[PDB]
């Protein structure tokens, strides 16, 4: 309910949202992504699509389907786009286009505005009617595999507009409008809502973690781009200087390979808790983020990382990988610290665990920074502004 957000962002931002919604209230809007049960894109749309409807926008949300072979091709496309590395069999491109065709037939695409989320459904623009097509990129495309990019740019160049999470992901090899809209957290979502101390305490104890002693938390998949092995290395280095400290890695199911290496890297320290929760364990993530003393998101590559703003909103200082969208959330020395190695991560863990007053000041700065920049009302407003801008130029 948009009324409830005045508490956080004030009345001017809400009036502005109603004003923009009035101008759009008889456009048909379709969002297309690749999972409804999944990660950050799903978490955003589950909150954002309902807010659009409540403003009287005709907004729908459809999910492409595929074989695991399709999702093997798109995972590798994802890693090649972010790392600039890999060998891509020519068969991958043929698998991709086939599942574009299959999905086009199963999805009505005749809307005034079509948002395509990330590379997986990007090839649906082949089957575009009229209307305004916007490619919403959530990942780091600053320095990609030239063959995968060259290919996807074949499709991207046919869109009317493009949204990236930070300006640094804008391509000078594209002439269509490129708009930087950071993602956001919904402060009223189960992930972010206040919890009674009782519920936090229950969930922490349930996983055998001691809330009498400091908790270092990373929330992330057991995936190379989140560097769980590096995170354990950071903790191992800090542990010598903060012996009572605990690490919680809060994961969600080649992924088993990384998890195994993570178990091996942890082989020795018994204050390491490598958890695996079902993906929709929102209240458990909430509870762990609230129980944390310091949060890490030590990513190698990261489009944005909602886990950062989630932690900052709960007044937790974040130690973040010095990459992509983490940099606009983690203001070095103010809301957290940016690090390029496990060694610097360890250095800043020890600093924060030993400097309570500085931790809490960072926590306050963190919440205020999210309040001004990364609440769902901010993303919703800029989203409505992009639609108005791009529809009026056809
Ligand atoms: O592209 C597939 C991945 O999409 C999600 O994450 C991306 O989008 C988030 C919201 O904009 C960003 O915070 C994040 O940095 C991006 O990688 C999803 O959460 C992942 O599980 C998928 O691999």
DSSP-derived secondary structure for 330-381: --BTTTEEEESSHHHHHHHHHHHHT-HHHHHHHHHHHHHHHHHHSBHHHHHH
In the chain, how many domains are there? 2
What is the SS3 assignment for 113? strand
Q: How far apart are the first and last CA of the chain?
A: 31
Those residues with Cβ within 8 angstroms of residue 36's Cβ, 6 or more apart along the chain or in another chain: 42, 46, 61, 63
Nearest residue by C-alpha to atom 21 in ligand 1: 39
304 lines ligand 1 (CB under 6 A): yes
Those residues with Cβ within 8 angstroms of residue 189's Cβ, 6 or more apart along the chain or in another chain: 43, 47, 282
Distance CA 16, CA 22 (A): 10
Report the 10 Å Cβ neighbour count for 108.
11
The answer as to whether 352 is a domain residue is yes
The answer as to whether 363 is a domain residue is yes
How many alpha carbons fall within 13 Å on the CB side of residue 190?
A: 9
Shared-domain flag, residues 113 and 245: no
Sort 356 into a burial class: Cβ within 10 Å, 0-12 / 13-18 / 19+.
exposed
Helix %, strand %, coil % for the chain, to 5? 50, 15, 35
Q: Measured at the alpha carbon of residue 52, what is the angle toward residues 376 and 368, in degrees to the nearest 5? A: 10
Residue 190 in tokens: 């189960």
CA 349 to ligand 1 center in whole angstroms: 26
Shared-domain flag, residues 96 and 202: no
Distance CA 319, CA 350 (A): 11
Distance CA 81, CA 148 (A): 7
Shared-domain flag, residues 23 and 112: yes
Report the 10 Å Cβ neighbour count for 116.
27
Its sign, for the CA torsion 173, 378, 285, 297, is positive
Nearest residue by C-alpha to atom 7 in ligand 1: 138
What is the SS3 assignment for 246? strand
Has 207 been labeled as part of a binding site? no
In this structure, are residues 133 and 117 in contact, taking their beta carbons and an 8 Å threshold?
no
DSSP state of 185: B
Shared-domain flag, residues 208 and 144: no
Residue 175 in tokens: 């002439």
The answer as to whether 281 is a domain residue is yes
For residue 119, give the ligand 1 atom closest to its CA: 1
CA 42 to ligand 1 center in whole angstroms: 9
For 7, 75, 103, 118, the CA distances from 70, given in Å and listed in that order, are: 44, 9, 12, 14
CA 192 to ligand 1 center in whole angstroms: 18
Contacts by residues 314-318 (CB-CB < 8 Å, ≥ 24 positions apart): 314/192, 314/289, 314/290, 314/367, 315/360, 315/363, 315/364, 315/366, 315/367, 316/217, 316/289, 316/292, 316/363, 316/366, 317/352, 317/359, 317/362, 317/363, 317/366, 318/294, 318/366
Distance CA 135, CA 187 (A): 26
Has 191 been labeled as part of a binding site? yes
Mutate to test the pocket of ligand 1, among 41, 79, 223, 378 (most ligand atoms within 8 A of CB): 41
Mutate to test the pocket of ligand 1, among 303, 323, 325, 328 (most ligand atoms within 8 A of CB): 303
Residue 367 in tokens: 């919440």
For 134, 159, 246, 275, 368, the CA distances from 137, given in Å and listed in that order, are: 9, 12, 36, 30, 26
Shared-domain flag, residues 114 and 238: no
CA 57 to ligand 1 center in whole angstroms: 25
Shared-domain flag, residues 221 and 172: no
Distance CA 284, CA 292 (A): 12
Has 40 been labeled as part of a binding site? yes
315: left (phi over 0), alpha (psi -120 to 50) or beta: left
Query: What is the domain extent for residue 345?
Result: 197-373
Shared-domain flag, residues 384 and 362: no
CATH number at residue 380: 3.40.50.2000
Those residues with Cβ within 8 angstroms of residue 93's Cβ, 6 or more apart along the chain or in another chain: 151
- For 173-244, strand residue ranges (E) read 178-180, 215-219
Q: Residue 389's closest CA among 95, 177, 89, 126?
A: 177
Shared-domain flag, residues 176 and 215: no
The answer as to whether 251 is a domain residue is yes
Those residues with Cβ within 8 angstroms of residue 10's Cβ, 6 or more apart along the chain or in another chain: none
138 lines ligand 1 (CB under 6 A): yes
Distance CA 103, CA 90 (A): 21
CA 364 to ligand 1 center in whole angstroms: 26
Distance CA 367, CA 278 (A): 27
In this structure, are residues 199 and 176 in contact, taking their beta carbons and an 8 Å threshold?
no
The answer as to whether 211 is a domain residue is yes
For 10, 177, 194, 300, the CA distances from 13, given in Å and listed in that order, are: 6, 24, 23, 34
For residue 303, give the ligand 1 atom closest to its CA: 15
Q: How far is CA 228 from the centre of its chain?
A: 17
271: left (phi over 0), alpha (psi -120 to 50) or beta: alpha
The answer as to whether 190 is a domain residue is no
Report the 10 Å Cβ neighbour count for 138.
22
The answer as to whether 189 is a domain residue is no
The answer as to whether 86 is a domain residue is yes
To the nearest 10°, report the CA torsion of 88, 225, 372, 358.
Answer: -160
Has 306 been labeled as part of a binding site? yes
CA 39 to ligand 1 center in whole angstroms: 6
Shared-domain flag, residues 177 and 285: no
Nearest residue by C-alpha to atom 20 in ligand 1: 39
CA 304 to ligand 1 center in whole angstroms: 8
Sort 311 into a burial class: Cβ within 10 Å, 0-12 / 13-18 / 19+.
buried
Shared-domain flag, residues 82 and 105: yes
Q: Measured at the alpha carbon of residue 338, what is the angle toward residues 333 and 339, in degrees to the nearest 5? A: 130
Shared-domain flag, residues 139 and 248: no
284 lines ligand 1 (CB under 6 A): no
Shared-domain flag, residues 297 and 205: yes
Distance CA 71, CA 97 (A): 13
To the nearest 10°, report the CA torsion of 204, 346, 253, 136.
Answer: 110
Has 71 been labeled as part of a binding site? no
Distance CA 356, CA 210 (A): 19
Has 304 been labeled as part of a binding site? yes
């Amino acid at each position: 309910m948009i009324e409830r957000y005045v508490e956080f962002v004030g009345e001017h931002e809400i009036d502005a949202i109603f004003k923009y919604a009035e101008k759009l209230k008889d456009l048909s809007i379709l969002h297309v992504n690749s999972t409804a049960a999944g990660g950050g894109v799903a978490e955003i749309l589950h909150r954002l699509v309902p807010l659009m409807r409540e403003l009287g926008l005709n907004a729908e949300w459809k999910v492409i389907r595929g074989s695991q072979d399709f999702f093997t091709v798109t995972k590798s496309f994802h890693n090649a786009l972010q790392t600039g590395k890999g060998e891509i069999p020519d068969e991958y491109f043929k698998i991709y286009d086939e599942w574009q065709e299959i999905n086009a037939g199963e999805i009505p695409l005749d809307y005034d505005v079509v948002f395509i989320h990330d590379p997986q459904p990007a090839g649906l623009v082949k089957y575009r009617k009229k209307g305004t097509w916007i490619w919403r990129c959530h990942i780091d495309i600053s320095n990609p595999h030239p063959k995968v990019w060259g290919f996807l740019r074949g499709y991207i160049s046919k869109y009317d507009g493009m949204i990236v999470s930070i300006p640094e992901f804008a391509r000078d090899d594209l002439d269509i409008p490129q708009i930087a809209i950071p993602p956001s957290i919904d402060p009223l979502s189960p992930k972010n809502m206040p919890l009674p101390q009782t519920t936090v305490d229950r969930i922490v104890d349930k996983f055998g973690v001691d809330r009498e002693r400091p908790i270092i938390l990373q929330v992330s998949r057991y995936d190379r781009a989140k560097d769980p092995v590096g995170v354990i290395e950071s903790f191992r280095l800090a542990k010598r200087h903060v012996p009572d400290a605990q690490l919680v890695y809060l994961g969600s199911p080649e992924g088993e390979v990384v998890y195994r290496e993570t178990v091996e890297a942890a082989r020795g320290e018994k204050d390491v808790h490598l958890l695996m929760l079902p993906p929709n364990s929102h209240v458990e993530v909430n509870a762990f983020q609230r129980a944390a003393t310091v949060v890490m998101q030590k990513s190698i590559k990261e489009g944005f990382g909602l886990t950062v703003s989630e932690a900052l909103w709960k007044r937790k200082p974040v130690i973040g990988g010095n990459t992509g969208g983490i940099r606009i959330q983690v203001i070095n020395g103010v809301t957290g610290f940016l690090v390029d190695s496990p060694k610097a991560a360890a250095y800043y863990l020890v600093y924060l665990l030993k400097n309570k007053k500085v931790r809490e000041e960072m926590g306050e700065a963190g919440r205020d920074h999210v309040r001004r920049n990364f609440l769902i009302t901010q993303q919703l407003r800029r989203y409505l502004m992009a639609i108005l801008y791009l529809t009026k130029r056809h």
